[model samples]
Target: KIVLKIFHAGSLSVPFEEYEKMFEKEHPNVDVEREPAGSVACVRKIIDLGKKADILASADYSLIPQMMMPKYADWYVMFARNEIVLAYTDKSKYKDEINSTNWYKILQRPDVKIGFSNPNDDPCGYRTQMVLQLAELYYKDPTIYDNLVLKHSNIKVEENNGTYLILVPKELDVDTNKLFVRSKETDLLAPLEAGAFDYLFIYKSVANQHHLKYIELPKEINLGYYEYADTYKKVALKIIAKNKTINAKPIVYGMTVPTNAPHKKEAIEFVKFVLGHPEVLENNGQPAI
Candidate 1:
């Protein structure tokens, strides 16, 4: 008879499924209402639209301070991490030739297809841009962003603490193109498997869940290393939305309980759940989100 609203990044769907079941089993009287979206859109629901939730979790923790601090939220804990990978399948265009070093080159092919979410709405979308931008910086080729990311798609990179690629018409608008963008990163994985799309900017967890072949992106380019955090900040994006623009920073996942939470006690309990089992998230064969 009780409902506790919880909003989180779409990438956390796997964990939230387990968390919801476990929490409901323990708190039998409580029903946890979970809302999953790209990390940015998840925060916008509260910051821009004034939606209410007992707890909030995101793939990128840094977004909390950037968008919600001192207003919609106070502080958050960077409780987990994931790494990026060039996720694909046998049906993928250059499966055999793709590797960390050659992924960008493979994606550059004419017949190849790739997809990422909207930077304005999802961390993966922005991170996809960041990865491309950083790859350009890493490879010393200024054309990576311009060619693979921006030129191929209508994405525009706005510079800031974090770089963002804004989608004016939304993912659905561009889904039909050779490049398949989606509201959630996971949504594109199926098409990659079914041979509908060649590649996807998705988390490693999803790639493994579907048993797809993946090229492990390096920590430097993947935004997965804490030591490289300072360097990662150098890449930023400004996404255009609603005739206005929101600057995005490097993608990092975060979790927090707001001051106005309806169930502060339960929210704190959930935080504790995240903290105590912190080490449990590691070695899970997934990327650091």
Candidate 2:
């Protein structure tokens, strides 16, 4: 059997499974093995750790050019898009009262806990930071990021004249009292359901797929809409893991066949299948690009 190793972002897990089922049916000799992680971790394994895989998919399209280019990968195709939201359940504290306008205020309450992924590992995690900082700009509340995130964690932000720069430490430091973090957004799903945290900053697609009640963030902060790219550019993150500054932009999922794909023919075939089947992603809540 030809084993096609597929490493992808955590959020792509469900949809890629669909691809696997269809791809395997078309070519019965191929066995599609999938590994899901924070997008950054996925790239690091193949690039820095020298792990081998047929394909690598990332939540942030920019990661391809910034981290994998010039050596590990030569090309990337952006296939899907996503946006961030405040996901919660009925078990959450003040669930009945929380709204888009008041989420930061509720998170700041003494007894509430907010969950997000690690910025150094997950785009959703760092995007959470960008979302809150963008909230400061949209709501005209200068302290949103400071009150919601700054005091609760080691993550720091600098106001560069008119723009914002978020510094993400490699080994993240969180108070875990008000702010809870995990490796990826999906890691917090069970905890959110059990009422471990009142709310979580996660992908809108994930929120919809899991049937969680989520507050839809504005276009100015959600990063779902491409038209607002200019506004999103105002915030940037400097991730120590990547050792580079990533400016905030709309969420676009990208994929590539590593320079030395073991199953080159099958990998190329799978890539063609995925590109031809954009419906798989949209049906899974991530819209096609």
Candidate 3:
């Protein structure tokens, strides 16, 4: 049997599994192996770890060009888009009192705890940073980022002129009492379900996939609209792993086959299946691009 290996972002796990089964059924002789991780770790598997993968799917399309272009991959296609949201369950603290407008206020409560992925590892993690910084401006609260991020974790935020900047270290030590941190955004789903966190910063699609309740942010700060691209760019994050600063832009998911893919032919077929079957993405809450 021909084995096809795929390394992808954790948030895509639900839909990717469906796609895998669909693809495998079409080619019964082919065995598809799927591995999910933070998008940055997915790329590191190829670039830093020297591992080979047939396909790479990233939550941020720019990552393909920013981290892997020329050296690891020659081309990539933007396939889908997702927005960041605050997800929680009925068992979470202050569940009844939370809403889109006052969710941040609820998070500030002494008994409440929030969870997000590691910024150095997941795009959702870094994007969560952008959302908070922009929320500070959006809600006209100067202390929003400080109260939510700085007050809980070792992560620091700075301002250069009118632009906001977040400095992310190679490793983040989040306060367990107030924050839950994991390698991937999806990794928090279990603890979230177990009532470990009152809220979680994650992609809207992921929340929908798991049937969790969520608060949607405004389009201006949600990173879901192309028209807000300029507004989103106002916030930026620095990743210590690559020593590269990434500016916030629209959230577009990208996919590509590595330059040295052992199963290039089969890999291309899988990508085509994904892009061509936009329904798969749409059904999973990620809009097809």
lDDT of 2 by residue, 1-289 (tens): 9899998999998899999999999999999999999998898899888899999999998999999996989999999999999999999999999997788888889899999998888889989999999999999999888988888888888887789999998888888888888999999999999988999999988888899999988999999989999999999999966679999999999999999899888898999899999999999899998
- At residue 30, what lDDT does model 3 achieve? 88
Q: lDDT of model 3 at residue 100?
A: 85
* Model 3: residues with Cα > 4 Å off, grouped in runs: none
Model 3, 105-177: lDDT tens digits are 9989889999999898899999999998988887889888899889888788778878877899887887788
Scored by Cα lDDT, where does model 2 land? Answer: 0.91
TM-score, structure 2 vs. true: 0.98
Give the lDDT of residue 279 in candidate 3.
Answer: 95
Cα displacement (Å) at residue 289, model 1:
12
Kindly give the number of clashing pairs for every candidate: 21, 0, 0
Which residue pairs of candidate 3 clash?
Answer: none
Using lDDT as the yardstick, the better of models 1 and 2 is 2
lDDT of the structure predicted as candidate 3: 0.91
Q: 83 in model 1: Cα distance from truth in Å?
A: 1.6
**Over all chains combined, what TM-score does candidate 1 have?**
0.86
